[PDB]
Amino acid sequence: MIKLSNITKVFHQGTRTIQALNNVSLHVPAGQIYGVIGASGAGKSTLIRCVNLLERPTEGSVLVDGQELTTLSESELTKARRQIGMIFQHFNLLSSRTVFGNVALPLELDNTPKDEVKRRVTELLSLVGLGDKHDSYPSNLSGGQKQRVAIARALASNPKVLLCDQATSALDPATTRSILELLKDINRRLGLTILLITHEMDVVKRICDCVAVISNGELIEQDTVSEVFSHPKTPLAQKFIQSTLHLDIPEDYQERLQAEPFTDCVPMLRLEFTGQSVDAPLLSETARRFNVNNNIISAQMDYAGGVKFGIMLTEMHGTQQDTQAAIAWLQEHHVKVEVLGYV
Amino acid sequence: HMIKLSNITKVFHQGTRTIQALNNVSLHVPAGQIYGVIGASGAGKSTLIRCVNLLERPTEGSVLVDGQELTTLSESELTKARRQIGMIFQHFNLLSSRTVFGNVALPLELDNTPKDEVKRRVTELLSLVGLGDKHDSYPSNLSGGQKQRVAIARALASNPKVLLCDQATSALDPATTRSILELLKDINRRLGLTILLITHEMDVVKRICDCVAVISNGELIEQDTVSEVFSHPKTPLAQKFIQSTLHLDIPEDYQERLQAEPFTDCVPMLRLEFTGQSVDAPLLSETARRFNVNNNIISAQMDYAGGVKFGIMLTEMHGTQQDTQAAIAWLQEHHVKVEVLGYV
Amino acid sequence: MSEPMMWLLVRGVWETLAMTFVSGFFGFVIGLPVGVLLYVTRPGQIIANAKLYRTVSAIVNIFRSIPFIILLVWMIPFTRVIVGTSIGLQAAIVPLTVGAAPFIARMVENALLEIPTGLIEASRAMGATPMQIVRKVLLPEALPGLVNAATITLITLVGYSAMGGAVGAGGLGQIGYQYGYIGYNATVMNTVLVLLVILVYLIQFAGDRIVRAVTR
Amino acid sequence: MSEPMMWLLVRGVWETLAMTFVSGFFGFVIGLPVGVLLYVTRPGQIIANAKLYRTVSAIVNIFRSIPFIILLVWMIPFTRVIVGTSIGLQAAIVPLTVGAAPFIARMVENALLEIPTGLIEASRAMGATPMQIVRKVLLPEALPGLVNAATITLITLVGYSAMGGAVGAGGLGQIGYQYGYIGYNATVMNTVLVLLVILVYLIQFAGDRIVRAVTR
């Protein structure tokens, strides 16, 4: 649906040149949920705008549904923008309208028969579970409830694409669950191409099929979710995976931690597990086989896109010949073993 | 005992309806110690702390600081009392109009002090907090932490015996809350300053607190020492907070599968408490070899609270109906608390 | 307490009202369009001529600076060339309209800068015309501030209307002037004062309450 | 222009600055404490009086709701009793400040309300007394706000003092009323206009210069 090619944008502000995005190219396969993760000022907000041209790229190419959006009549670009729905962090609804009317607005803009907008709005409202809430104002609604109105309104046009700007960025984790679950059931049911940006790796997990990772206005990794969570290529990606998995090496350890082996030391290890590795009784096997003691300082395990992964920080008590033997055994079994230092 | 709160009960009438903020809350902060009060938002933390200061009036109870009674007192007495209790706040409460310097000095101006000590006292307290560079800056210029240093130095101006903290690190980032808390920590150790503390963040508690009360809905549910609360938590809620500080996530997929009703081809999912004795003891590695069990670790963390090691594990245990029953029992003997959350 | 007198004084109450609202009305006719012109023309906004906003905001300002009587007096030749007369309300509502308009527009602009941008953004992404944004989004969203604007416009105009008595615009203010500044009949001066105080409150209770009803 | 006129203008320019600035001062000596004591009495504040507030708040609203000219005229007896005159430069100042106090007090409280309540809390916590908290904390914090109000008050007082020249306060307002209305010289009117506009821009520009001077 979305193919952005070599897209770069420079802002004109303050006698200062900023790169919001630099040589950015992104294909999103029709039918798929595609995340973009990065940091504040990393250039994602700029980017997601570039799709429906809420921002004009200083160079590069946007095309949606085969149609290049860069050179367009402002009157053709409205018609173009019918096929791209959008939603926002702060939900952006008219306080002056009800749930119903708020959804009917985009239908109003490009003129639709009184009954057709009734049909459409009323349908999209049950779809989002707001058919109960028809007459309410945004005053009386939940951040989630609002974001559901926001969704229904995005789909009024019946588009081929749904843009999400930090769409969950402020929400109940519980409710963040419900809205992403809903975006998903729309992907699956309706074949709606979805592109979203976030700083939250947790949403990237939940509904994304692919994920890009972006810095200094360039996105360095483009892969599947499975790949990136399990086999992060860039240290920065790893760091993000240290957000999702919470791995805390306690503070007493760093002062306690030795760069090289000292007499009567045991090694400290970072063990990274992948897929089947993760359900394996690998450490309990090493207890018996190599007569070693694994002490676990920290361990987390997580699903990302149908592949399990996990990391744990452990001590290993044993011989030099026993320890060197479990570690190898572990490696042969595809635990990644990294020796952090000594305790 | 430096500060003593006794049967403190505070009620409010806001609406038609009448809410009870605090019910028979009692706690003693021994001098030279750092005391945390943790709880959910709306438990009465903010009220509780305030009473000590009589920024709030306890409906009934006793408030005793440095031995001196407060509740019934003369407003001119309450001023000299307040010279003994410094306070800092979540929203840093600095005058936007004044320099970091003069901001500190304002409490010194409240009772009249010669300009000479002020220049002295303030320069000192600023070298303490690490702002000495910044004497001439305006708060709008400061980053979040810098403001709290100012607020701290300012509360320390009167050279008070007791420092109160109202969610004092709550708006800072993880990085700064570490550096603020450790700065407070020093003042406690170096100057022996007494600290009362309120947080919603258990992390704040396990970092610098000696004692901890868990408060829930105006009530104190668990009162013990930090060492004692993070090790052998006597309350489910207490466990909830602790279980939080160490970030322990049981993925949705597990909770969905976990069922307290046991089935066929099922293994128990159980959560394990380790205290300082059992923390470094290789009780799981042993337990495999001896009882021919497979230990599957779903997540786990070890930490320190109050100079004491401890930790928690969610694992599933793979073995024979007997083998499983056996190794569980061997962990209980070794001071692992074994609690079975279901079968899977 | 003359029945002769009371009826003129009660003709006066009509004199303010006509003067207040007809000006208020025409003020907005000019004030409201000019107000959206300012708003949308500001740097961040839709049309965004910082050169056009500089011009219009200047016109707006110098007119707001002129105190009203000085504007009322200075305006007579023009008031006349317009109405053909000078004394009397139908002439007074000329300088009373020009008194209000610039004062209004700045309120409009300020009332539009009140609604969160990014309803514009949400809005643009839907294919929204600039017209459509103003009409379909901006104005309806600003409304409780548009009504509060008029309550202030109107209440301001009553007092403006009364300065016209000294210049013989012929309203409750003129009765206070003639009888207060010269005659000093004590019952009419007390009555004129209370009448007008009463008129401010009614204007505000009406608007103050109608705002309550338009919000959400 | 006649040389006896140029010299007459220069009285008015003075008689205007006179009235406006003096009225201002007295109006603050009053509205300021009124404002402060309107802020405190609200629910939740240092001394919370439901009823005391209501009384002071209604009366300021009453006083504020009387269009100035009507205030002046209704005040004729007051003025003479206190001044010994209803006429002239210093007579003007009585009504002119009574007309300023409600503006000022309302503004002062609205300025105080800009100050985050946690500042009070910090202050009581240091053992500061309700007087200390005002002069040591609250006022300093709204100084930009308050200086803004002063600007806005003095400007208001110009228009007020000008309308005083219909009722013989003298000043540039008198000069306009006579030579723009009673009988007309184009030149004299036109330099009355222009003088007044400049007095306002100067009053505005200066205030902003002060407010922009307060530290962020």
Ligand SMILES: Nc1ncnc2c1ncn2[C@@H]1O[C@H](COP(=O)(O)OP(=O)(O)O)[C@@H](O)[C@H]1O
């Ligand atoms: N309209 C704009 N004008 C000027 N600078 C902008 C504008 N939008 C964004 N920027 C700046 O350029 C960078 C673009 O990144 P952005 O799209 O905001 O990514 P993020 O969503 O991670 O903040 C930001 O650091 C921002 O400060």
Ligand SMILES: Nc1ncnc2c1ncn2[C@@H]1O[C@H](COP(=O)(O)OP(=O)(O)O)[C@@H](O)[C@H]1O
């Ligand atoms: N000044 C007040 N007026 C009315 N109700 C209050 C007031 N202060 C607290 N409450 C109520 O009592 C509870 C006391 O909690 P609070 O003092 O805010 O501590 P916490 O930090 O636990 O929320 C609040 O949840 C609130 O509902």
